[PDB]
Amino acid sequence: GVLYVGSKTKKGVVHGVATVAEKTKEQVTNVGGAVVTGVTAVAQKTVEGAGSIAAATGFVKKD
Amino acid sequence: GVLYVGSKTKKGVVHGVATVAEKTKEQVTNVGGAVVTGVTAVAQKTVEGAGSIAAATGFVKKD
Amino acid sequence: GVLYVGSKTKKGVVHGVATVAEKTKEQVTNVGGAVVTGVTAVAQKTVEGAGSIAAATGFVKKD
Amino acid sequence: GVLYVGSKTKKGVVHGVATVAEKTKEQVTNVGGAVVTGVTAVAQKTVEGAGSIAAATGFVKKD
Amino acid sequence: GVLYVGSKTKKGVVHGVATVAEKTKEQVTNVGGAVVTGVTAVAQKTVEGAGSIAAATGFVKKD
Amino acid sequence: GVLYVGSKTKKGVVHGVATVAEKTKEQVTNVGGAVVTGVTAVAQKTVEGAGSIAAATGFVKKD
Amino acid sequence: GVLYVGSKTKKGVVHGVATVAEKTKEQVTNVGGAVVTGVTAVAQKTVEGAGSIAAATGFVKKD
Amino acid sequence: GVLYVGSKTKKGVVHGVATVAEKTKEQVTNVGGAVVTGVTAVAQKTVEGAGSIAAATGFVKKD
Amino acid sequence: GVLYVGSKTKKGVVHGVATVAEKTKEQVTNVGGAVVTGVTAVAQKTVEGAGSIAAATGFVKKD
Amino acid sequence: GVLYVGSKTKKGVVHGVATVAEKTKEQVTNVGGAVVTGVTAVAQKTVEGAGSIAAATGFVKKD
Structure with a gap:
């Protein structure tokens, strides 16, 4: 669009x-x-596809 | 649109x-x-596909 | 639209x-x-697909 | 619309x-x-698909 | 509309x-x-599909 | 004192x-x-003498 | 003192x-x-003498 | 003192x-x-003498 | 002192x-x-003498 | 002192x-x-004499 x-x-x-x-x-x-900073700040993202994974994690502790 | x-x-x-x-x-x-910051700040995201996963986690502790 | x-x-x-x-x-x-901050702040998101998962968790402790 | x-x-x-x-x-x-903050703040989200899951949890402790 | x-x-x-x-x-x-905050704050969400699940839980303790 | x-x-x-x-x-x-303003605000005044005049007036209109 | x-x-x-x-x-x-402003604000004044005049007036209009 | x-x-x-x-x-x-401003603001004044005049006036209009 | x-x-x-x-x-x-401004701001004034005049006026209009 | x-x-x-x-x-x-400005700002004034005049005026209009 x-x-x-x-x-x-x-x-x-x-x-x-x-x-x-x-x-x-x-x-x-x-x-x-x-991370977009300013007077007039614009961020745009498009993902086209099946089975997409977006994963965000602070921290992982494993033992 | x-x-x-x-x-x-x-x-x-x-x-x-x-x-x-x-x-x-x-x-x-x-x-x-x-993360979008400003006078006039705009963020737009589009995901097109079946079975999409968006996962956000502070932290994971596993033992 | x-x-x-x-x-x-x-x-x-x-x-x-x-x-x-x-x-x-x-x-x-x-x-x-x-996270969108400003004078005039706009955030828009569209997800098109069957079986989409949006999951947000503070923290997980597993033992 | x-x-x-x-x-x-x-x-x-x-x-x-x-x-x-x-x-x-x-x-x-x-x-x-x-999270949208400002003078004039607008957030819009659309999910199109069968069997969509939106799940939000403070924290999980499992042992 | x-x-x-x-x-x-x-x-x-x-x-x-x-x-x-x-x-x-x-x-x-x-x-x-x-979470939408401001002078003039608007939030709109649309979910189109059968069998949609929206679940929000403070915390879960399981042992 | x-x-x-x-x-x-x-x-x-x-x-x-x-x-x-x-x-x-x-x-x-x-x-x-x-005019004294603060966390912990102190004002102290001492006048030593005969025939002292302290006069405060909002406004005077004379014609 | x-x-x-x-x-x-x-x-x-x-x-x-x-x-x-x-x-x-x-x-x-x-x-x-x-005019004293702050965290911890102190004002002190001493006048030593006979016939002292302290006069404060908003405004005077004379015609 | x-x-x-x-x-x-x-x-x-x-x-x-x-x-x-x-x-x-x-x-x-x-x-x-x-006019004293700060964290820790102190103003001190001493006048020693007979017949002292302290006068403060917003404005004077005379015609 | x-x-x-x-x-x-x-x-x-x-x-x-x-x-x-x-x-x-x-x-x-x-x-x-x-006019004294700062973290830790101090102003001190001493006037020693008979017949001292301190006068402060916003504005004077005379016709 | x-x-x-x-x-x-x-x-x-x-x-x-x-x-x-x-x-x-x-x-x-x-x-x-x-006019004294800073971290740690100090102003000190001493006037020694009879008949001293300190006068401060915004503006004077005379016609």
């Missing part, structure tokens, strides 16, 4: 993703797709 | 995602899709 | 998602879809 | 999702769909 | 979802659908 | 003095002494 | 003095002494 | 003095003493 | 004095003393 | 004085003393 984005802005201030740790052991920021 | 986004703004201040830990052991921020 | 979003704003201040932990052991913020 | 959103605002201040823990052991914020 | 949302506001202040725990063991905030 | 102020606080939120006018003609907020 | 101020605070948020006018003609915020 | 101020703070956010006018004609914020 | 200020702070954010005008004619912020 | 200022800070962010005008005619920010 058609994806149409039109934007007029005088002033924009944007902070995307921040991970801050002090005296910490296991800290995970995990994003399955894309 | 048609996705149409039109936006007029004088001033915008945007903070997307923040993970902050002090003296912490296991901290997880987990996003299955995309 | 048609998704139409039109927005006029003078001033906007937006904070999306914050995870804050002090002296904590297991903290999980888990989002199955997308 | 048609989804039409039109919004005029002078000033907006928006806080989406906050998880705050002090001296805590297991804390879970779990969202099966998307 | 047609979903039409039109909104005029001078000033809006909005807080969506907050989970706060101090000295707590198991705390779960669990949302099966989407 | 002795003025002793001791204060322990975890979290404090303080708003001192606000004057808000819309479509208004003559609005006066008038404070003869000092 | 002795003025002793001792303060312990984890988190403090302080707003001192705000004057806000829209479509207004004459708006006056008038403080005879000092 | 002795003025003693001792302050321990983890996090402080302080806004001192704000004057905001839109479509306004005469707006006055007038402070006779000092 | 003795003025003693001792301050321990981890994080401080301080905004002193802001004057903001849009489409406005006469706007005055007037401070007779000093 | 003795003025003693001792300050320990990890992180400080300080904004002193801001004057912002759009489409405005007469805007005055007027400070009789000094």
Whole structure:
């Protein structure tokens, strides 16, 4: 189809993703797709096919 | 179809995602899709197919 | 179909998602879809197919 | 069909999702769909198919 | 059909979802659908198919 | 003498003095002494002398 | 004498003095002494002498 | 004498003095003493002498 | 005498004095003393003498 | 006497004085003393003499 984005802005201030740790052991920021930051930010994804798998996991501990 | 986004703004201040830990052991921020931040932020996803699996899990501990 | 979003704003201040932990052991913020933040934020998802599975779980402990 | 959103605002201040823990052991914020935050925030999802499963669970402990 | 949302506001202040725990063991905030926050917030979902399952559970303990 | 102020606080939120006018003609907020705002706020004044005058007046219209 | 101020605070948020006018003609915020704002704010004044005058007036219109 | 101020703070956010006018004609914020803003803010003034005058006036219109 | 200020702070954010005008004619912020801003801000003034005059006025219109 | 200022800070962010005008005619920010901004900001003034005059005025219009 058609994806149409039109934007007029005088002033924009944007902070995307921040991970801050002090005296910490296991800290995970995990994003399955894309990370898009800005004034006027657009992300588009298309998957065409049978039996598609999208899997996102913080952490796995196995013993 | 048609996705149409039109936006007029004088001033915008945007903070997307923040993970902050002090003296912490296991901290997880987990996003299955995309992370989109801004003045005028758009995310679109299409999956075409039979038997599709989208799975998101914080953490798995197995023993 | 048609998704139409039109927005006029003078001033906007937006904070999306914050995870804050002090002296904590297991903290999980888990989002199955997308994280979209802004003045004028739009997220759209379409899944076309039989037997689709969307599963979101904080954490799993197995022993 | 048609989804039409039109919004005029002078000033907006928006806080989406906050998880705050002090001296805590297991804390879970779990969202099966998307997290959309802003002045003018729109989320739309369509699932077309027989036998679709949407399942959201805080946490599972099995032994 | 047609979903039409039109909104005029001078000033809006909005807080969506907050989970706060101090000295707590198991705390779960669990949302099966989407989390949408803002001045003018709209969420729409359509499921087309026989035998669809939507299941949301805080936590499961099995032994 | 002795003025002793001791204060322990975890979290404090303080708003001192606000004057808000819309479509208004003559609005006066008038404070003869000092304006002191905070977590732990202290104001002390000493006047030593004969025939001292402290006078505070909103407004004077003379014709 | 002795003025002793001792303060312990984890988190403090302080707003001192705000004057806000829209479509207004004459708006006056008038403080005879000092304006002191903070976490732990202290103001002290001493006047030593005979016949001292402290006078504070919003506005004067004379014709 | 002795003025003693001792302050321990983890996090402080302080806004001192704000004057905001839109479509306004005469707006006055007038402070006779000092303007002191911070985490730990202290203002001290001493006047030694006979016949001292401290006078603060928003505005004067004379015709 | 003795003025003693001792301050321990981890994080401080301080905004002193802001004057903001849009489409406005006469706007005055007037401070007779000093303007001191910071984490740990101190202002001290001493006047020694007979017949001292401290006068602060927003504005004067004379015809 | 003795003025003693001792300050320990990890992180400080300080904004002193801001004057912002759009489409405005007469805007005055007027400070009789000094303007001191910083992490650890100190201003001290001493006037020794009879008949001292300190006068601060926004603006004067005379015809």
